[PDB]
Design a protein around this motif. Structure first.
Motif, PDB file in Angstrom:
ATOM      1  N   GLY B  27     -40.870 -17.975 -14.919  1.00 39.51           N
ATOM      2  CA  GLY B  27     -41.082 -16.718 -14.376  1.00 39.51           C
ATOM      3  C   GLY B  27     -43.059 -16.955 -15.282  1.00 39.51           C
ATOM      4  O   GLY B  27     -43.228 -17.765 -16.042  1.00 39.51           O
ATOM      5  N   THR B  28     -43.294 -15.887 -15.049  1.00 33.10           N
ATOM      6  CA  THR B  28     -44.778 -15.701 -15.178  1.00 33.10           C
ATOM      7  C   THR B  28     -45.437 -14.312 -14.952  1.00 33.10           C
ATOM      8  O   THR B  28     -44.815 -13.611 -14.392  1.00 33.10           O
ATOM      9  N   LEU B  29     -46.330 -14.215 -15.492  1.00 29.23           N
ATOM     10  CA  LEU B  29     -46.935 -12.626 -15.908  1.00 29.23           C
ATOM     11  C   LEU B  29     -48.101 -13.129 -15.663  1.00 29.23           C
ATOM     12  O   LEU B  29     -48.706 -13.917 -16.647  1.00 29.23           O
ATOM     13  N   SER B  30     -48.938 -12.888 -14.787  1.00 38.79           N
ATOM     14  CA  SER B  30     -50.764 -13.095 -14.874  1.00 38.79           C
ATOM     15  C   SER B  30     -51.559 -12.971 -14.330  1.00 38.79           C
ATOM     16  O   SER B  30     -51.653 -11.435 -13.397  1.00 38.79           O
ATOM     17  N   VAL B  31     -53.006 -13.027 -14.455  1.00 38.38           N
ATOM     18  CA  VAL B  31     -54.235 -12.608 -14.351  1.00 38.38           C
ATOM     19  C   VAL B  31     -54.877 -13.696 -14.182  1.00 38.38           C
ATOM     20  O   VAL B  31     -55.050 -14.530 -14.379  1.00 38.38           O
ATOM     21  N   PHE B  32     -56.629 -13.045 -13.003  1.00 41.33           N
ATOM     22  CA  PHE B  32     -56.721 -14.185 -12.761  1.00 41.33           C
ATOM     23  C   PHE B  32     -58.230 -13.673 -12.613  1.00 41.33           C
ATOM     24  O   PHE B  32     -58.568 -12.793 -12.172  1.00 41.33           O
ATOM     25  N   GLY B  33     -59.181 -14.385 -13.925  1.00 38.05           N
ATOM     26  CA  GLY B  33     -60.345 -14.210 -14.078  1.00 38.05           C
ATOM     27  C   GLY B  33     -60.403 -13.821 -15.181  1.00 38.05           C
ATOM     28  O   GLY B  33     -60.730 -12.679 -15.127  1.00 38.05           O
ATOM     29  N   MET B  34     -61.122 -14.354 -16.354  1.00 38.90           N
ATOM     30  CA  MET B  34     -61.357 -13.939 -18.091  1.00 38.90           C
ATOM     31  C   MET B  34     -62.518 -14.904 -18.235  1.00 38.90           C
ATOM     32  O   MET B  34     -62.203 -16.258 -17.673  1.00 38.90           O
ATOM     33  N   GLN B  35     -63.174 -14.429 -19.373  1.00 42.91           N
ATOM     34  CA  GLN B  35     -63.629 -15.369 -20.066  1.00 42.91           C
ATOM     35  C   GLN B  35     -64.065 -14.578 -21.853  1.00 42.91           C
ATOM     36  O   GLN B  35     -64.096 -13.753 -21.969  1.00 42.91           O
ATOM     37  N   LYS B 217     -77.429 -28.428 -32.589  1.00 45.74           N
ATOM     38  CA  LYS B 217     -76.638 -28.187 -33.203  1.00 45.74           C
ATOM     39  C   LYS B 217     -75.567 -27.028 -32.249  1.00 45.74           C
ATOM     40  O   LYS B 217     -76.551 -26.862 -30.827  1.00 45.74           O
ATOM     41  N   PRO B 218     -74.298 -27.554 -32.087  1.00 47.50           N
ATOM     42  CA  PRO B 218     -73.423 -26.195 -31.959  1.00 47.50           C
ATOM     43  C   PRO B 218     -73.702 -24.888 -31.301  1.00 47.50           C
ATOM     44  O   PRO B 218     -74.781 -24.685 -32.015  1.00 47.50           O
ATOM     45  N   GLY B 219     -73.870 -24.885 -29.940  1.00 40.49           N
ATOM     46  CA  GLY B 219     -74.506 -23.604 -29.919  1.00 40.49           C
ATOM     47  C   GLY B 219     -72.831 -22.752 -29.860  1.00 40.49           C
ATOM     48  O   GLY B 219     -72.134 -21.886 -30.184  1.00 40.49           O
ATOM     49  N   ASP B 220     -72.783 -22.064 -27.961  1.00 41.09           N
ATOM     50  CA  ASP B 220     -71.503 -21.757 -28.154  1.00 41.09           C
ATOM     51  C   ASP B 220     -70.641 -21.973 -26.940  1.00 41.09           C
ATOM     52  O   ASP B 220     -70.282 -23.362 -26.109  1.00 41.09           O
ATOM     53  N   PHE B 221     -69.097 -21.884 -27.142  1.00 42.65           N
ATOM     54  CA  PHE B 221     -68.411 -22.410 -25.917  1.00 42.65           C
ATOM     55  C   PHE B 221     -67.202 -21.106 -25.093  1.00 42.65           C
ATOM     56  O   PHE B 221     -66.683 -20.090 -25.576  1.00 42.65           O
ATOM     57  N   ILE B 222     -67.903 -21.591 -23.957  1.00 43.20           N
ATOM     58  CA  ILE B 222     -67.511 -20.663 -22.981  1.00 43.20           C
ATOM     59  C   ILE B 222     -65.956 -20.462 -22.559  1.00 43.20           C
ATOM     60  O   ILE B 222     -66.701 -21.490 -21.808  1.00 43.20           O
ATOM     61  N   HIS B 223     -65.187 -20.398 -22.820  1.00 39.53           N
ATOM     62  CA  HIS B 223     -64.341 -20.153 -21.652  1.00 39.53           C
ATOM     63  C   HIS B 223     -63.878 -19.395 -20.699  1.00 39.53           C
ATOM     64  O   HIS B 223     -63.163 -18.478 -20.459  1.00 39.53           O
ATOM     65  N   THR B 224     -63.589 -19.920 -19.405  1.00 34.17           N
ATOM     66  CA  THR B 224     -63.347 -19.325 -18.180  1.00 34.17           C
ATOM     67  C   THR B 224     -61.804 -19.780 -17.756  1.00 34.17           C
ATOM     68  O   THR B 224     -62.228 -20.761 -16.891  1.00 34.17           O
ATOM     69  N   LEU B 225     -61.774 -18.406 -17.974  1.00 32.58           N
ATOM     70  CA  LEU B 225     -59.947 -18.661 -16.325  1.00 32.58           C
ATOM     71  C   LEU B 225     -59.901 -17.818 -15.508  1.00 32.58           C
ATOM     72  O   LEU B 225     -60.414 -17.132 -15.131  1.00 32.58           O
ATOM     73  N   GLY B 226     -59.367 -19.366 -14.453  1.00 33.91           N
ATOM     74  CA  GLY B 226     -58.566 -19.339 -13.359  1.00 33.91           C
ATOM     75  C   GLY B 226     -57.754 -18.455 -12.736  1.00 33.91           C
ATOM     76  O   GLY B 226     -57.348 -17.296 -12.984  1.00 33.91           O
ATOM     77  N   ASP B 227     -56.351 -18.758 -12.864  1.00 33.71           N
ATOM     78  CA  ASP B 227     -55.835 -17.786 -13.065  1.00 33.71           C
ATOM     79  C   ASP B 227     -54.213 -18.297 -14.404  1.00 33.71           C
ATOM     80  O   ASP B 227     -53.969 -19.354 -15.073  1.00 33.71           O
TER      81      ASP B 227
END
Ligand SMILES: Nc1nc(=O)c2c(CCc3ccc(C(=O)N[C@@H](CCC(=O)O)C(=O)O)cc3)c[nH]c2[nH]1
Ligand SMILES: Nc1nc(=O)c2c(CCc3ccc(C(=O)N[C@@H](CCC(=O)O)C(=O)O)cc3)c[nH]c2[nH]1
Ligand SMILES: *c1cc(=O)[nH]c(=O)n1[C@H]1C[C@H](O)[C@@H](COP(=O)(O)O)O1
Ligand SMILES: *c1cc(=O)[nH]c(=O)n1[C@H]1C[C@H](O)[C@@H](COP(=O)(O)O)O1
Lengths: 286, 286
Positions: B27-35, B217-227
């Motif tokens: 089973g799953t509990l989901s959201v669509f679109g996050m960052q 030098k490393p800056g930021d890491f932007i994590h974008t989620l779909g499902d």
């Protein structure tokens, strides 16, 4: 409301955005990584703080769907937005001297309907060739809306060298839940002053279309930006727009029942209650 | 701090996510679109509210970089995470009976280094074939960091039918400004309990690597989620983790000067000051 998300990004880019040079020679203020959620429930996100060229929007989408890569086929509808990148000077600057003016190469349309296809020219017959991602999406939504892979991708590493200008909106994914359809888009590059207002309305339109064909109600449209920028010659016009107050988004009504996505014609759509602020001209960086 | 962004998403999905069925039967509990924006400045985002299997993370990345698509080559390093999807039963359920066990098909590795290449088997010689997006990125960062097209895309519409499991992290783009390198990733599907913690650390590592090779030098890491989803059998373990308090992220030190990205070996890296909470087991949905 929703238009506030956009206005927010414009301001954020202006205050913090770092000045950056770009390929067009113009100057730029940019930010990397943003996301806005636009609701398609009983409203279509067509900016109100400025009057957006809805026609070119609709006409462009239709141009994409039939898989055309010829600026002239769109300029024929009274939407000149792509002519610039199809010119002789521009084509030549890329070294495409043998190419006929108007042939953008294997871009948007071609990738949506014939991803694998081996490109020839803006007039070749590709039917039956390559994978048709668009139709593929439609069918998956219809048979298994839980599918976590409903994706349409325009970015094609192998064809890049032949594109007059690589896809800015390079990838989008659809999602279904509770009978409502949502879409998220990944836009590597975002000209906040011109393309973005167009882009947002373009995908909200695509979603409505697909939702219609599948018998689902529109959900949300998630806009994800990679390199979101404001060109230097867009700074003053934008500064004024930022000062205007938004109005309620209009509604998009579909005047008829359509089965296949290729059946849609400009006449099948109609915007209602659109009361935007005066227009604002902004020069496109070539 | 940073780990709060993750913990937030876990909670949001739990209190506001909709129950949804998935291909694995679970089973799953989901959201669509996050960052979420993770800073790589003087810190490496390796979750602390749980002890993450750093080894499998590093080993997997290395496995990807050399373009391997064989679960066995990784299982050889003591990282069994992919064996499941390379099994005989799983391969057969997809109709890949003629395929040898362990051959995941044209996934991650293969697309990063040979996008255009025509796939054969997990043991074929692809060198010189297809486009090498990884190297491409490196060189662009080195010669024109203003480039708005520094992209590496694993999603390949044409090869999908042969993949044991399509890319979850399907596209990432890099950005440069003030001598520091940032990376954003588009993850169509996100198993919040297992993959995501891995994913986040995996790309933060990739960024560090490329930043090293390019002298940035490393800056930021932007994590974008779909499902983004939380499997039902992950709900209780997650509920406990949500209760733990985060600690300061550790640091990632690179013990040596490396020129080419293929030179990196597991030994070149070292994590410092990692003090996480106890481990938490969670069953992977097949
Ligand atoms: N630099 C750059 N940015 C882009 O977004 C782009 C594109 C995307 C399509 C595009 C181009 C121009 C306008 C546009 O000019 N819109 C205007 C007027 C449109 C008209 O009436 O012809 C507007 O104010 O919306 C709207 C959309 C192609 N080449 C480009 N190059
Ligand atoms: N449903 C699903 N989710 C995924 O993330 C995934 C993947 C990504 C690779 C992967 C698989 C398992 C674990 C994993 O099990 N991690 C454990 C510990 C593992 C160990 O001890 O080796 C964890 O707690 O993170 C970590 C990473 C492939 N197929 C998948 N299918
Ligand atoms: C491209 C097309 C689109 O739909 N949206 C956009 O905003 N753009 C803009 C971004 C940039 O100004 C230019 C493409 O330039 P580049 O390839 O990223 O260098 O058009
Ligand atoms: C896939 C690979 C990865 O690195 N990250 C992930 O979390 N996953 C997860 C997503 C999803 O839970 C499952 C793949 O399932 P499906 O193909 O979307 O049906 O693994």
């Amino acid at each position: 409301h929703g238009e506030l998300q956009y206005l927010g990004q414009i301001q954020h880019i202006l205050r913090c955005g770092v000045e950056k040079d770009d390929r067009t020679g113009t100057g730029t203020l940019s930010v990397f990584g943003m996301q806005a959620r636009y609701s398609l429930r009983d409203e279509f996100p067509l900016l109100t703080t400025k009057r957006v060229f809805w026609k070119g929007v609709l006409e462009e989408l239709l141009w994409f769907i039939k898989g055309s890569t010829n600026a002239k086929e769109l300029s024929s509808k009274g939407v000149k937005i792509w002519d610039a990148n199809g010119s002789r000077d521009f084509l030549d600057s890329l070294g495409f001297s043998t190419r006929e003016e108007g042939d953008l190469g294997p871009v948007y349309g071609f990738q949506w309907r014939h991803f694998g296809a081996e490109y020839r020219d803006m007039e070749s017959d590709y039917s039956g060739q390559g994978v048709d991602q668009l139709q593929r999406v439609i069918d998956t939504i219809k048979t298994n809306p839980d599918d976590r892979r409903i994706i349409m991708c325009a970015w094609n590493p192998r064809d890049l060298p032949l594109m007059a200008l690589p896809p800015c909106h390079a990838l989008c994914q659809f999602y279904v839940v509770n009978s409502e359809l949502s879409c998220q888009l990944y836009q590597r590059s975002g000209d906040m002053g011109l393309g973005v207002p167009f882009n947002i309305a373009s995908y909200a339109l695509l979603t409505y279309m697909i939702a219609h064909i599948t018998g689902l109600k529109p959900g949300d449209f998630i806009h994800t930006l990679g390199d979101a920028h404001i060109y230097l010659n867009h700074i003053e016009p934008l500064k004024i727009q930022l000062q205007r107050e938004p109005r309620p988004f209009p509604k998009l009504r579909i005047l008829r029942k359509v089965e296949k996505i290729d059946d849609f014609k400009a006449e099948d759509f109609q915007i209602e209650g659109y009361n935007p602020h005066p227009t604002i001209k902004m020069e496109m960086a070539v």
